[PDB]
């Protein structure tokens, strides 16, 4: 009726969306290699004839928290965590290359090296890494080199077979896709395998969700949500009062 | 007074737009760099520091801006409607228009290039410099101009604004027309 009902409704709806965005981070505190999503609000003015008094606010995801996660020491050979900044190249079920930070690796019955989510890990050849089937000792190098020991072979047979593809692009050019894999915003952009990133083998990288940061965002989203609801109530209260004009 | 490292921090938004509207500042730090637009309208600033680099637009309407030092770089436009500037220095990197309406401007540097419109409305300027090239419209309404330079390039329409033109350029490539 006054268009301030919808101006406040559109703000209250967006505050719920930001609340859900923060809720996903808290639901994913223990997730491995999880980058917390950032939430903010953007002011978009309604340009047109009349006084510039109506400005909408909509929530967006400007970026992600690319800080180093909490490293968990597991003493497992097939667990690796990226030191500092970096990524691991994996292809999902669609055969589409995407960057990940989950270094919880495993070997299937055929020998292909996958991660906890089943994404095949790429290597120097840019093809999924395949290991000889009857292994005896698998050690992951600090730079990503994979050295294996054939079954029954003596100690002095630690030959390298593959090198984990570690990619360190600009963090501002990466977006989180629909399946948690970060990809270039510009499509058809090759992932250059960096040789500077290092793996801290024997440990797993946790999530970087700042629990306090989400909680203080929640309490501010609640108060701003409630204040706009009062604006909706006072908008209809004014409308009801301004109805006796035609009540002759 | 002057602008310090922390004085400017209180007038900057998330996109580096410096707003000094009616602030009692008289000068800016030497070698000043502003990421975004700079607004110094209605300010007692008399001279811009040398080496000023603006990533946006300049607005100094109704201000005391009188002197600009050479080497200043402006990515956008320079809006000086109603300032106190008397002379325009040579070598200013300007990517927009130069609005000098209601200014005491008298002289302009030779071979000046303006990438947009040029307004010298109500200015005591006596003669446009030879080699002046304007990529937009020309406004000379209410000015003291009565003689045009021999060669000038106005990509837009020249607006006389009332003053009588006694001499026309010999080499003039005009993309528009001439209006009184």
């Amino acid at each position: 009726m006054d268009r301030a009902l919808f101006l406040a409704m559109s703000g209250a709806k967006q505050n719920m969306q930001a609340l859900q965005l923060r809720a996903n981070n808290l639901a994913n505190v223990s997730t491995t290699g999880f980058r917390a999503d950032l939430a903010q609000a953007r002011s978009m003015q309604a340009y047109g004839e009349g006084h510039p008094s109506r400005v909408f606010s909509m929530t967006e995801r400007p970026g992600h928290n690319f800080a180093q996660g909490s490293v968990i020491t597991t003493g497992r050979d097939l667990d690796v965590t990226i030191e500092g900044s970096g990524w691991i190249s994996v292809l999902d079920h669609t055969g589409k290359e995407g960057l990940t930070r989950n270094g919880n690796l495993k070997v299937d019955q055929n020998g292909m090296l996958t991660n906890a989510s089943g994404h095949l890990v790429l290597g120097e050849n840019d093809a999924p890494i395949t290991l000889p089937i009857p292994l005896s000792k698998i050690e992951i190098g600090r730079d990503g080199t994979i050295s294996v020991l054939p079954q029954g072979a003596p100690a002095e047979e630690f030959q390298a077979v593959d090198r984990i593809k570690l990619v360190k692009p600009n963090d501002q050019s990466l977006f989180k896709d629909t399946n948690g894999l970060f990809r270039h915003k510009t499509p058809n952009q090759p992932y250059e395998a960096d040789a500077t990133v290092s793996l801290q083998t024997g440990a797993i990288e946790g999530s970087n969700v700042n629990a306090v940061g989400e909680m203080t965002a929640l309490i501010d989203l609640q108060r701003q949500f409630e204040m706009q609801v009062k604006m909706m109530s006072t908008a209809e209260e004014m409308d009801k009062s301004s109805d006796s004009l035609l009540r002759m | 007074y002057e602008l310090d490292y922390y004085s400017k921090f209180g007038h900057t938004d998330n996109y580096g737009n410096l707003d000094l509207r009616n602030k009692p500042y008289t000068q800016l730090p030497s070698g000043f760099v502003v990421k975004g637009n700079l607004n110094i309208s209605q300010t007692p600033i008399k001279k811009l520091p040398k080496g000023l680099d603006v990533g946006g637009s300049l607005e100094a309407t109704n201000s005391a801006l009188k002197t600009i030092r050479s080497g200043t770089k402006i990515k956008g436009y320079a809006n000086l409607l109603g300032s106190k500037i008397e002379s325009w220095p040579r070598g200013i990197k300007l990517g927009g228009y130069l609005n000098l309406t209601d200014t005491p401007l008298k002289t302009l540097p030779a071979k000046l290039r303006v990438k947009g419109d040029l307004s010298v409305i109500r200015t005591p300027i006596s003669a446009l410099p030879e080699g002046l090239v304007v990529d937009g419209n020309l406004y000379i309404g209410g000015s003291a101009l009565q003689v045009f330079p021999d060669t000038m390039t106005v990509k837009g329409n020249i607006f006389l604004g009332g003053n009588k033109i006694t001499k026309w350029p010999s080499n003039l490539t005009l993309g528009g027309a001439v209006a009184p």
Binding site: - | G36, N37, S57, K75, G76, G95
Partner: peptide
């Protein structure tokens, strides 16, 4: 008119020479 009053039109800006130049 009031000084410093906001305008109801997009704010002519920098990128896209189009605005930096046209008055």
């Amino acid at each position: 008119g009031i000084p410093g009053a906001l305008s109801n039109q997009p704010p002519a800006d920098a990128s896209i020479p189009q605005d930096v130049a046209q008055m």
